[PDB]
Each structure stands twice: as structure tokens, then as C-alpha cells.
From a paper:
Here, we identify an alternative approach to sulfoquinovoside hydrolysis that is adopted by these organisms and discover a family of SQases belonging to a new glycoside hydrolase family (GH188). These new SQases operate through an oxidoreductive mechanism that results in net hydrolysis and involves a catalytic NAD+ cofactor. The SqgA proteins adopt a two-domain fold with an N-terminal dinucleotide binding Rossmann domain and a C-terminal α/β dimerization domain. The structures reveal homodimers, consistent with molar mass analysis using size-exclusion chromatography-multiangle laser light scattering in solution.
FlSqgA from Flavobacterium sp. strain [name] was selected for further study. Further analysis revealed that the small increase in product formation observed in the presence of Mn2+ was a result of improved enzyme stability; thus, Mn2+ was included in subsequent kinetic studies. These data show that FlSqgA is a metal-independent NAD+-dependent SQase. No activity was observed against 4-nitrophenyl α- and β-glucosides or 4-nitrophenyl β-glucuronic acid, showing that FlSqgA is specific for SQ glycosides. Another feature of NAD+-dependent glycosidases is the ability of many members to act on both α- and β-linked glycosides. Both 4-nitrophenyl α- and β-sulfoquinovosides (α-PNPSQ and β-PNPSQ) were substrates with the following Michaelis–Menten kinetic parameters: α-PNPSQ, kcat = 0.025 ± 0.002 s–1, KM = 2.9 ± 0.8 mM, and kcat/KM = 0.012 ± 0.001 mM–1 s–1; β-PNPSQ, kcat = 0.014 ± 0.002 s–1, KM = 1.7 ± 0.6 mM, and kcat/KM = 0.008 ± 0.001 mM–1 s–1. Soaking and cocrystallization experiments provided structures of the ArSqgA·NAD+·SQ and FlSqgA·NAD+·SQ complexes, which diffracted to 2.4 and 2.3 Å, respectively. Both ternary complexes were essentially identical, with respect to the active site interactions. Three-dimensional X-ray structures of complexes with SQ and NAD+ provide insight into the catalytic mechanism, which involves transient oxidation at C3.
Author numbering:
A (entry chain C), B (entry chain A): 9 to 371
The structure:
């Protein structure tokens, strides 16, 4: 197995999930980790469990000559500046950049121009499509088992945002807002599943429950914690997103349903084991419901135990790394492009704007 | 048992469901049926199974001296004119008037003035709240078991509109549109459950699938067959409605979820037995999902077999009749008032307008 040397820029929560997944893939060697918070470097080094060179600044990692590929897992509002440095570095390194790829309309416009002239693989790390149960419903939709598709519903019911370094995720300025930070994944799935582009978005949401009295270094937390979104698409399909960040009692965290003119399909995805009751491992299900003849078929979709244990996104990060590896080695394309990243972000920003202004937003 | 003599104005599909439910209630006697379609009279008479007087015109039924109470189950666009004749008749008869109570903004304004001066019970027959599983979740919400309520989602996945006499239900002018005809029930449940009034509605929907090969003197149906709706409320709660009229493969026809800041509750309601596979009786469920401690509780909500067999609305029409009986006997209130009927209609009209204009509508 050809060795790829990975550099991690950002060494927090999600970086450690990247570490655990790369450990499952022969040929993967972390050589370099950059993070301006020493305790993050220590904790990530322990997770890696073998010697790496650490850096406080990403520019030193880029100049290190230690790496064949990068992973960026720093806070959302830092993604553009890190990417700009990579583009100007002359290293020509591949990049897996965590979602959201950026956090504002200005950032998005700039990244679009810059990324156009960069030739190395740039993959946006929206991994949800590779969850085995999600893959089944995408294959169903694309194969025509559902007929012509008209509707897509995504319901996410989960716990409040977790505690992060410097509390970065508690503020819209740093995150893009909830509909970008948490929901870009879902807007991307909408494009993928419907194979269509959005034309109009409306959202209603509020900051109603979570983190209400929390101030950090003189700032008040201002993130939406529940919302509904309706998205219209060019081809006369429509999708709906429901989010609650205070519905963590729900055994199933995600429900995704697709309705076509020949059938319906629905996946239910359990809470990750590390957040659920220690005890009852529940499996994800896919239920296919043809219009005629009546007779829904439901089955469980198992994930390999090691793939599943390595992350909190139901095996998806592992398949993302297989895909990125093939891109680095020039044996595969980038499945999730900058342009996918930009569309999902602009959809999320349009949603955040709709929530504020109480009006639908055109795209 | 105190006898109530019922007059039916409109003797089609839903009237026969009224007949079957009144048959379960001691003291109920149908004496009079008015319908301008002879075949409807015959078919309803057979359902009743005992001699009744029949009329082609409702005015003759009102003058008959045969009745203590009325049920109106004629096409939606006729409800107002029949009610006006009852109000001006001087009979002072109680009325159970099928939903939607009316079909346009003008009708609604007129009915509001007229109904104010009428003193006999006028009950709008939105019965869904009395479905045993729906009753449980309303009791849960109102009792505070969920904490403060923030979100309400209603998903209806069902078969295309059934065939009616004169195909009345295939046209928006005659129905109020899909969001009035089919969805007034749901908008009313939103008001009931949230105990709040709507301020803004947005809906996306289309006529995408159904009734495309049905031609009626050269006209096609113009009714929506799928939609999403978001409703904001005065108190900063929000609800979402999802409708598909071409999702009849779904084992569960209705899903309703309420999310509060202490817990979530969710009911699933099966397709009525005469529309589903002959064979698998599925029960309705209610699942209670507290935020803390984790531990969802799910149970079946059984309905009495006779109550269930008498209707296609999961036992609800029977409890509606018990309620209306008490109103007629002067011993109970009208649970679902004209004003409830008018609000649900105005909500639906606003949704129909939003679908057309691609903008949110104020209330
Ligand atoms: N794809 C997914 O499923 C998923 C899941 C979780 C997080 N994320 C994403 O991962 C990223 C990080 O989130 P997290 O949960 O790991 O947060 P975290 O707070 O645990 O980690 C962020 C780390 O970045 C470091 N950092 C801050 N500024 C930096 C800079 N300029 N350069 C380098 N490092 C910097 C911090 O010191 C910290 O160690 C975000 O973009 C988030 O959206 C994605
Ligand atoms: N609450 C519910 O669950 C529910 C269920 C089904 C129908 N409905 C309502 O019941 C009503 C009737 O629908 P249906 O499914 O029984 O339709 P249907 O077409 O089966 O019956 C309608 C009947 O009304 C008669 N009619 C037509 N014009 C009339 C008039 N001017 N005066 C008197 N009768 C007239 C027709 O001849 C026919 O027999 C509608 O308002 C519909 O919205 C409610
Ligand atoms: O739970 S938090 O860590 O607060 C927030 C994160 O949660 C999930 O894992 C999502 O995939 C991710 O996109 C998001 O950044
Ligand atoms: O199936 S149809 O009869 O066409 C349409 C009817 O559907 C259900 O029975 C609803 O309760 C009723 O409101 C509506 O009028």
C-alpha cells in the first residue's frame, strides 16, 4: 500500500475522528498537526498514538515538506484563510476541507475565484451521503425505483451544540449560523438526491431553548436551535428540512423520506452510540413503500463495527477517506467539489436570511 | 334514551359514515335525508337500513317538522348557502356542518356576520382531534409533559382524492383548493395543540401527479396533490405540514410530532383498513421521548373495533357524534366552533395563495 503522509490543520474534535478513520486505511500516515491551542495538540497526539511533528501555525506545516495531503478541521470562519494560504503556497497539496467550506457570501465569492485556478484535489468534507443507509436511498432515487421524484424531507432531532475550543460554535459570526454550520450537509443531500438546483428558499426558525444566558468573552450566543425550511427546485420538486437541537430523546436522530410517483422510501438513523443510552444499540432502517401494489418492505442496514466505532456519522467518514485517498493517488475524482460546498453554504445563508427577514429568498 | 331525530343534507360518501356512527349511539334516529342526486338518496337509504323520508331540496327537509338536528355533508362550496337557509328558516335547529365550513374569503366574512346572530349549536365537523392517539398527544401537550412547546410537524401521506358525485372535489372553485379541503383539519390541530394563533404562512406545492388522464367535459383537475407548509404563530412557535396525495404505499398515513423543551411525542396512524392490505391490521402508536433521562416509551393506542369499523378516520367520527349529541341535548358545549372553522379555512386560503405567488402570506 502506497503511503500517503497526512497533515492535519486543526486538531480538535472532528480532527480526532479523521485520525481514527485514517487508522483503518492501510497506507495512511499522519506526519504533521497544526493547531494554535496546545491542549488540542496534546489530545490529538494521544489519539494518533505514534510520533508526529506538531506546529502552532499552519504556514509552518505547509512549509514542512512532511506531507502529501492536508485535512482542514479548524473553525468554520478560518477555512477560507487557510485555503488561500494553501492556494498561494506553491505546494500543490490536495486538501480535504471540513464543511462548511465558508461562512459568508463574500467568502463564497472569493473562494469561487481562487479555487478555479488551483489544480490539486479540493474535496469538501460533507460525508453524510456515504452513510450506508443514506447510500441506499440515493441509489433507489437515482435508479428510478421511486419513479419521478417530487418530495424530499429531512428531519434532524438532536442534542444542543457541544462545547468547542473558544466556544466558536456558539456564534453566528464564527459559524455562518446554524443553517450553514449544521445544515449545509442536508442542503447538499437535497441537490444530490433530487439532481436539481434550488430556486427559492423559505425558513422559519428561532433561538428558543439552548444556550440562552451564555456569554463568552463578552459575547452572547445567538445561534438558531430550531427551524423549518422549504426549498423549491428548478424542476418543480421541493424539499423540507426540520431541525431541533433540543430533541435528543428521539431514538432516531435523522429521518429522510423521498416521495416519488411510483413509491416512497424512508431511512431512520439512530443516535451515535457515544451519545445514546449505553446498552441498546439500535440499527438504521430503510423502508421501501411502493404505491402499487401495496406492500412496504423494511430492512436494517448494518455498518461494519470498526467503521461505525471510529466516528459519530454512522460510518460515513471512513468512506470519505477511501474516496479522498483515490483522489490523491489520481485514481478517483473529487466527489464533493468546492462548487458543492459553495451551493450548500449559499443555500444555508439564504435560509438564515429568510429566518431574519420573514420572507422567501430567491437563488 | 332521549331520541334525537337527525336530518342529513347531503347524502353521499361522508353522510354514510355519519349514518354508521349514529347507529352506534342509542337515541339516534335518522328521519330525513335531502340530496338533489337520486342515486345518493337510494344508497344512503340502504346504508341507514330503515325507512326515512327523502327530499330533493333541503328547504323541504327544513319545513318537514321531522328533525331535531341537522348534519350537512354536501360539497364544500354549498355549505354557506345551506347554513344561510337554516339561519333564515326560523327552525333554530342545531347543525353539524362538515369541513371546510366554507371555501373563500368572501364566504368566510359573510358567515362570520351571520353566525354571530344564530343561537342554536353550530359545530364544524373537524373530527381528527378525537382520534384516540391524537387525543393522547393533545393531552400530553396541554398537561405540560412536553415542557413549553416549540414545534409541531404533521405529515400526511395518502392516496389521490376519491371519486365524488359530479366530480366536485376535482376543482379548486368547488373545494377551496387542496389546502382548504384536505388540510383545514391540520391547521385546526395546529391551533388546538399549540394553543396559539397564526401570524404568517408559507407554502410550496403543485399539481404534479394525480388525475392527469381524467377529463370532465374537456377540463382537468386543478387541485394541488403535494405541498409543504410552514406556519408561524403569535407566541414564537412554528409548525410544518407535509402533504402527498400519491404516497399511499406508506403503512402510516399520518405522523404528528410535537417537540417541547422537555420532551417530544409522536403519533403514527395507519391507513384505514378498507384502503389498506386486507390482512395486516396495524395499530396506531404513541411514542414519548423525554430529553432527560433518555428513554423513549412507545405503546399502541387501540380503538374499539366497532367504532373503528364505522369510519375511515380512526374512530374520530363516533366521538364527534357523542359531543354533538350533548350539544343538541343542551348538556355540553360546541367543541369546534364556526370561528375554528373560519380560522382553519383562512389558514388554508393563505397557503393556497402562497403556493401561487411564491411569497409568505400574513394573517
Ligand atoms: N463533517 C462533519 O460531520 C463534522 C463534524 C464535526 C465538526 N465538523 C467541522 O470540523 C471543524 C472543527 O470542529 P470541531 O468539532 O473539531 O471543533 P473543535 O473546537 O473541537 O476544534 C477546532 C480546533 O481548531 C483549532 N483552531 C482554531 N483556529 C485555528 C486556526 N486558525 N488554524 C488551525 N487550527 C485552529 C482550535 O484550537 C481547535 O483545536 C468545523 O469546521 C466543523 O464544522 C464537521
Ligand atoms: N370530516 C371528514 O373526515 C370528511 C370526510 C369526507 C368528506 N368530508 C366532507 O363531506 C362533504 C361531502 O363529501 P363526500 O365525500 O360525502 O362527497 P360525495 O360527493 O360523496 O357526497 C356529496 C353529496 O352532496 C350532494 N349535493 C350536491 N349538491 C348539493 C346541494 N346543493 N345540496 C345538498 N346536497 C348536495 C351530492 O348529490 C352528493 O350525494 C364535503 O364537505 C367534504 O369536504 C369530510
Ligand atoms: O454536535 S456538534 O459537534 O456541536 C456540531 C457538529 O455536529 C454534527 O456532528 C455535524 O455532522 C457537524 O456538521 C456539526 O459541525
Ligand atoms: O379521500 S377523499 O374522500 O377524496 C377526501 C377526504 O379525505 C379524508 O377522508 C378527509 O378526512 C376529508 O377531509 C377529505 O374530504
Amino acid at each position: 500500500a502506497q503511503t500517503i503522509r497526512y497533515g492535519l490543520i486543526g486538531a480538535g474534535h472532528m480532527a480526532r475522528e479523521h485520525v481514527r478513520n485514517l487508522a483503518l486505511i492501510p497506507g495512511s500516515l499522519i506526519t504533521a498537526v497544526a493547531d494554535p491551542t496546545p491542549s488540542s495538540l496534546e489530545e490529538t497526539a494521544r489519539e494518533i498514538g505514534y510520533d508526529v511533528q506538531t506546529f502552532s501555525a499552519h504556514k509552518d506545516l505547509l512549509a514542512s515538506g512532511l506531507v502529501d495531503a492536508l485535512v482542514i478541521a479548524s473553525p468554520n470562519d478560518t477555512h477560507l484563510e487557510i485555503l488561500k494560504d494553501i492556494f498561494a503556497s506553491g505546494t500543490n497539496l490536495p486538501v480535504l476541507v471540513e464543511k462548511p467550506v465558508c461562512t459568508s457570501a463574500e467568502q463564497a465569492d472569493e473562494l469561487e475565484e481562487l479555487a478555479a485556478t488551483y489544480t490539486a484535489p479540493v474535496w469538501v468534507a460533507m460525508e453524510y451521503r456515504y452513510m450506508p443507509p443514506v447510500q441506499e436511498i440515493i441509489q433507489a432515487a437515482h435508479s428510478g425505483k421511486l419513479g419521478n421524484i417530487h418530495m424530499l424531507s429531512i428531519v434532524e432531532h438532536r442534542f444542543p451544540f457541544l462545547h468547542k475550543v473558544d466556544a466558536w460554535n456558539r456564534f453566528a459570526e464564527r459559524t455562518g449560523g446554524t443553517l450553514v454550520e449544521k445544515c449545509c450537509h442536508f442542503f447538499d443531500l437535497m441537490r444530490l438526491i433530487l439532481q436539481d438546483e434550488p430556486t427559492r428558499i423559505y425558513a422559519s426558525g428561532g433561538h428558543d431553548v439552548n444556550h440562552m444566558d451564555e456569554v463568552y468573552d463578552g459575547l452572547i450566543s445567538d445561534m438558531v436551535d430550531n427551524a423549518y425550511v422549504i426549498v423549491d427546485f428548478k424542476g418543480g420538486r421541493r424539499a423540507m428540512l426540520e431541525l431541533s437541537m433540543f430533541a435528543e430523546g428521539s431514538k432516531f436522530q435523522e429521518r429522510i423520506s423521498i416521495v416519488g410517483d411510483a413509491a416512497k422510501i424512508e431511512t431512520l438513523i439512530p443516535v451515535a452510540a457515544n451519545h445514546w443510552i449505553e446498552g441498546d444499540e439500535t440499527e438504521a432502517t430503510v423502508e421501501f413503500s411502493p404505491r402499487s401494489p401495496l406492500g412496504p418492505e423494511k430492512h436494517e442496514v448494518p455498518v461494519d463495527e470498526a467503521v461505525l466505532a471510529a466516528g459519530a456519522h454512522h460510518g460515513s467518514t471512513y468512506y470519505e477517506h477511501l474516496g479522498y485517498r483515490k483522489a490523491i493517488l489520481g485514481e478517483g475524482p473529487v466527489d464533493v467539489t468546492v462548487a458543492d460546498g459553495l451551493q450548500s453554504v449559499r443555500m444555508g445563508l439564504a435560509a438564515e436570511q429568510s429566518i431574519i427577514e420573514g420572507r422567501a429568498v430567491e437563488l
